[PDB]
From Swiss-Prot, chains A, B:
Gene this protein is translated from: gag-pol
Function: The aspartyl protease mediates proteolytic cleavages of Gag and Gag-Pol polyproteins during or shortly after the release of the virion from the plasma membrane. Cleavages take place as an ordered, step-wise cascade to yield mature proteins. This process is called maturation. Displays maximal activity during the budding process just prior to particle release from the cell.
Residue ranges annotated for the Peptidase A2 domain, each copy included: 32-113
Disulfide bridge partners, by residue number: none
SUBUNIT field: Active as a homodimer.
Included range, full protein: 578 to 701 of 1603
Name of the protein described by the UniProt record: Protease p15
Amino acid sequence: LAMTMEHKDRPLVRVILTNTGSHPVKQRSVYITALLDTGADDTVISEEDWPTDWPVMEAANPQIHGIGGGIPVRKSRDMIELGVINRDGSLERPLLLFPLVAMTPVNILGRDCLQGLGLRLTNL
Amino acid sequence: LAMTMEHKDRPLVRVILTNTGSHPVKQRSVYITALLDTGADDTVISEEDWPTDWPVMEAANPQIHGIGGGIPVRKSRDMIELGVINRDGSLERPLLLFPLVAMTPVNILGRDCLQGLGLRLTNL
Ligand SMILES: CCCC[C@H](NC(=O)[C@H](C)NC(=O)[C@H](CCC(=O)O)NC(=O)[C@H](Cc1ccccc1)NC[C@H](CC(C)C)NC(=O)[C@@H](NC(=O)[C@@H](N)CCCNC(N)=[NH2+])C(C)C)C(N)=O
């Protein structure tokens, strides 16, 4: 990946998720749009994009906090496989994880994912 | 500036702010800490580190929405000069703005002054 910081355009990307849980779900693979968030410790998919059938459990800390304050957070129970699509077509490396889900206004890939993809923010 | 993204520790820089306004201030220059934030569109200095004796305007829209809800903002009257000292004291390029001011848990270097530093995310 390579993506110049532009104040006007948010570092937005195409992401395909895939529930790999040995257990049925209506749709194993979905499609979303997700901001690349460096001030985001964690990767959290909004509840309005999380499938009503993909199970969830307790996240270790009842909520996540940000600007306005804390927002309730639950965690993925199955391992989702997260795959990133670069603007031009190409595919970034597949990473697996148990995401956090909450009423986020946007799905954000936090520093845990950013790190897996091998991302350094640079002006060099 | 070339920060490799870890989930581990945050993209934090130590900054310098100078009130370039033609009016007395107690202290013109202050050192603060800040996080590099691609998910944030504006730079927002904490009410905590803002020497509240640098006037503000309630200007724009009391933005500051994030996963929390909304929070009031002010924006600096006087153009502020902002400098990114990296680990060595070597400063980056001086930027000039009118940061937004709110009760942010941390000072954010948003994309605007993030594209002014030339920062871009990459793994190539
Ligand atoms: C015991 C510790 C366990 C770990 C757990 N960690 C957290 O809660 C941590 C601190 N939270 C975070 O990392 C959260 C994201 C949630 C998450 O990943 O968990 N990050 C954040 O909230 C960061 C900023 C931040 C940085 C440091 C500290 C606090 C906040 N902001 C993310 C957020 C995303 C955006 C799409 C709405 N951006 C904003 O809040 C910025 N807002 C904007 O740029 C607006 N102008 C436009 C967005 C609104 N509209 C919309 N979305 N359609 C603002 C900073 C200028 C905890 N502490 O409970």
